[PDB]
Design a protein around this ligand. Sequence first.
Ligand SMILES: Nc1ncnc2c1ncn2[C@@H]1O[C@H](COP(=O)(O)OP(=O)(O)NP(=O)(O)O)[C@@H](O)[C@H]1O
Ligand SMILES: Nc1ncnc2c1ncn2[C@@H]1O[C@H](COP(=O)(O)OP(=O)(O)O)[C@@H](O)[C@H]1O
Ligand SMILES: [Mg+2]
Ligand SMILES: [Mg+2]
Ligand SMILES: [Mg+2]
Lengths: 7, 372, 734, 139
Amino acid sequence: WXAXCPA
Amino acid sequence: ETTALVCDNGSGLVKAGFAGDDAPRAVFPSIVGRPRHQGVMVGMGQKDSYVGDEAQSKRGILTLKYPIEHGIITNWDDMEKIWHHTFYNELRVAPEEHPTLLTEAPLNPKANREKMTQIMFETFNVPAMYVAIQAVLSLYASGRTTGIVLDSGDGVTHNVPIYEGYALPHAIMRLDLAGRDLTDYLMKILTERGYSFVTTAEREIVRDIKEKLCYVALDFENEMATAASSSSLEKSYELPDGQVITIGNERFRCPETLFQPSFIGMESAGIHETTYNSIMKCDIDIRKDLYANNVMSGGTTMYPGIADRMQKEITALAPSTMKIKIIAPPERKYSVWIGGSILASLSTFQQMWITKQEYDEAGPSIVHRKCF
Amino acid sequence: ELYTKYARVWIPDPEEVWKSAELLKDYKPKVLQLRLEKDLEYCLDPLPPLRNPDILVGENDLTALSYLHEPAVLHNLKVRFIDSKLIYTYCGIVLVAINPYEQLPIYGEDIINAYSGQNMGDMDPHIFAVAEEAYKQMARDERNQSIIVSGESGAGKTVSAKYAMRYFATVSGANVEEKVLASNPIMESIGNAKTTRNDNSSRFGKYIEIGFDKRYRIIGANMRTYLLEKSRVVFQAEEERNYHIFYQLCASAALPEFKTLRLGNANYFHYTKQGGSPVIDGIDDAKEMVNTRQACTLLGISDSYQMGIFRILAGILHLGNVEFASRDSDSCAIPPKHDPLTIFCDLMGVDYEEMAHWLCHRKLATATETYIKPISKLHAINARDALAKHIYANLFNWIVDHVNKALHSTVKQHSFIGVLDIYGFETFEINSFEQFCINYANEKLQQQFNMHVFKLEQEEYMKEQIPWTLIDFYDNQPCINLIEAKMGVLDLLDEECKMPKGSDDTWAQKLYNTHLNKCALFEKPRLSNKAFIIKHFADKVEYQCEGFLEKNKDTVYEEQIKVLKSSKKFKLLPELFQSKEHKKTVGHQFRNSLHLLMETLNATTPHYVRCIKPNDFKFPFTFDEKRAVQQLRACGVLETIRISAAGFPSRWTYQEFFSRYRVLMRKQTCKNVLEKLILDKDKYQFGKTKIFFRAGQVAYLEKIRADKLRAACIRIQKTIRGWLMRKKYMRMRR
Amino acid sequence: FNKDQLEEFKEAFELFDRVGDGKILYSQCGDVMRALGQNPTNAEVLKVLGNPKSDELKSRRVDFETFLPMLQAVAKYEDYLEGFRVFDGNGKVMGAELRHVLTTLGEKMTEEEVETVLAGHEDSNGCINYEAFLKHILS
Ligand SMILES: Nc1ncnc2c1ncn2[C@@H]1O[C@H](COP(=O)(O)OP(=O)(O)NP(=O)(O)O)[C@@H](O)[C@H]1O
Ligand SMILES: Nc1ncnc2c1ncn2[C@@H]1O[C@H](COP(=O)(O)OP(=O)(O)O)[C@@H](O)[C@H]1O
Ligand SMILES: [Mg+2]
Ligand SMILES: [Mg+2]
Ligand SMILES: [Mg+2]
């Protein structure tokens, strides 16, 4: 994604 | 005349076809493989990289990777490759000839819709296009105007409630658990039984086990006590080379994690609870009709028994006096495409396509106001 | 004014749509003293039609009358039909015929002699007078000619076409006409229905292409059919029958051959029963079957195929009795040992257990993978009825094609003249998908007529070197765009068949949102939210939304046809069938068949007939304004009349004008002496051989005629009376 | 009219007295008016007569003195030509047509009157020189 999750 | 292209990017399978027919006429994984070894033989037709069913077949020598992870697109060059392969090789139809309809999961970064439009207009010159929520199309596919949808592919799981064709934004729940990241768990529990699958090719081999042999236990605790006591649940499967592997409680134990995401160390409760806690955010006048229709969609809902586990525990959570009905046709793996195929063939929908005139006027910002 | 002591007018009355009125003394620039046919005072509303000068009335062609309006036309048709006993009449190119219900001398060989060679100027109208123009145009050019026939049913479209071609047979000399007239019993039986206002209504367009060889002797014929009304097979409104063949067959059922079929009585079967009315008045179904078979034999379908045909129709009926019990809302099954399905699967030589499977289930194939899945009891009943409609339409196309094989003939066909029977514009209290489609097809033919008549006027004007611009085009493209353009009524109906939980309530609401004020031609009936109104060329017609989603749904699940095709018991069934098309709705199939009809006719320069049926209890040679005003509107003649009163209706060859008018009073001098007499100037025009007038100038010209001739007579008589009395004086001097 | 005119006209009037009372009938009034050069219509004659009823027209008798004001009041070619030219452009008129119009239009006359006045004025084709017939009847 951009913050929390890896993508 | 001209007929819309209808495409669902998913993760794993891409499935595409012309609107107004019964089922997609291209399905292939959304996978791109690049070769990693030194090629020795000369004059071989060796190639930059492979897409889809090619990379599945050659996968022994490839690094497979997926350009879509939890419904976000993470690579753009590989995604362009996959769409390019879809339109030219799989459908053998130019984009210029046809408006395109594209599918997406809700609650995910707006940059994704911006980029996906910018590509479809600029590189393909698709004459018009639209971007649509998966859950919405599952109701078109199942013949209903009211219901709560549970849709899970690889990556994203989400619930959308819909009541007489109004959406209910505040009640939308989204969950990253489903489908890909069951398999990463299943690899670990198989490691407990002394098999080790490391590379991405071995990941595809695990995924084929998961599709073949997992099922959901009506009561998890009785079935663990049973398989602990007995071999009767135990089935054996033949790896591609001709070894044979035997798997026990691991087969039901893997899809249990959809009901207890603590198994992988996520915080949130399973699909039964987010489905219920979605219904709880709707106004009391409609809950009877949401409880009366639940539509399950996408491949992760295929496991034998998942509907009947779901009905049992929602019936435990829900107040006692009502029908809980779970509606899960055998076709459900394609329902998002089938519903897109209905939707793009309507006449009313012909006024809703974003057209190149407007994109050229407005830039890619337009997608947010015109589309959902 | 044009109103004077002497003028005459028409005023309305309930018993007969118009009555004549003399005018007691003039309207002055109110309310009118009138006297009738013996007292009236008649309200003007803040003026009545001026009757034409009676020197014109009574004649071949209506367009000539100086004042063109509905009571004058209906007057001519009354006088010449009842008193003169002439049926045929002309309105521009349109021929007009009143059905007499009575035989006449006019069709005889001596009349064939009389017309053959003549042109349209030469004679009084008769159907042969059109047939000989068609033949003259076909001689002038390779170009084919068409003859187009319209009316309500029982207006005699068939008898008119019959004589129309008998004229060809007698001029050219091919034992086609015997065969064509022997084809009719079966195409009545398969093609016609009882309807609320008629028996033996024809529900389809039938085109007989009469083909000629270079010598214009007749080769043969080819037959086509369009616009067959499929939905009637499975559904009737109250007081309608299903297509006659079903009832002829059911009445026969006691007979030896048909014993095999286990046919019930006429109200045993779900498809026959719904309409309510098994017995047509005064007709032997049991005999009419026999005349059907006899004519089928005369066109040389073997007695094997006739028993095939009746097997298939018994199949369609026994199929109709299949009944589904729901085991979920989502799913249903046929309760086992179901006698309707048992007999159906025996009759059509298939496995009971496969029709049992495929009626209840539908199958979907992905490119690698395929699923059986069940369907709801509603979808089951829809799919069964759609299968009956599919079988029936394919059987009709097959008897069409066999009749073709026996008509159609060995010598190849140089060129042809074509004869089209098609139903007219139609209204009842209750108007429903069938009437909607019929009225749409009639709107589309009326376009062609309007455009062709416009163009053949315009070219006459160019032949006179008259300035074009005075001609005006009456356009009805805005209504067709309402019915058939995208986001049109047929379009949102084909949409609502897709939409989940589609209903006639939501369909109506879509209509209103789309059109209700965005267009002038669509209107909502004041008191109802279930109906809508279209402004057609003739009429405003109110349609009920109740029917359309029942009738418009056609889909056939291919697995059902691939069951039937397997059947080995008799050849005919797999002979009938011959995948995109299976998804089309009835409305869209009709919209396509109509385009083939248009592409057939637009190729070809038409001549028209209109038939009208002057009374409803069918008494001989008797006439009612009630009935005829309606039918003359339905046939569109009353629009034609008005569109021709707009423009320049009246036209005059110079010397014959001057031949009388000097009696009041060459081309330039007479033009000038007119122009000094009268300011007609804008309302008259000049060309190579004629002056044209607008309406009502010819009357004014006779009014000035009477003014002069009366004044002259007063002077002439007083002058000669001067000697008359001086004569009695000279007598007295003696 | 002066005394000389009145004397000649009165003598003519008295010639019409068929009863000896020095009077004529109303119906002879027209003969005297027309014989003296007037060409009044039957309407004009009835107006100066007072729109008489059948009975007084047929039996009431008037002397010259009462007739005279009516004759005076009544007394006080191109139109004649155009009137004949109505039925013509070579200057002729069918004898059948003139006979028909005189016996069928306007104040219709008898066939015998028309035969007497028309005798000798139509030629072999059955055409009437209307200028000559008009001059004849105006003389
Ligand atoms: N010119 C005519 N001469 C004699 N009978 C006629 C004539 N025109 C119509 N008819 C009558 O029309 C009736 C029905 O004729 P038919 O040949 O069956 O065709 P039709 O029923 O009029 N076709 P349709 O208009 O669809 O009902 C018969 O009773 C005929 O007597
Ligand atoms: N028959 C099956 N049983 C269990 N899991 C399946 C089955 N078929 C596919 N899956 C899994 O579901 C995922 C594919 O779901 P899908 O709906 O195709 O995803 P998407 O919606 O992204 O296309 C993959 O992880 C696949 O392994
Ligand atoms: Mg998906
Ligand atoms: Mg008929
Ligand atoms: Mg008939």
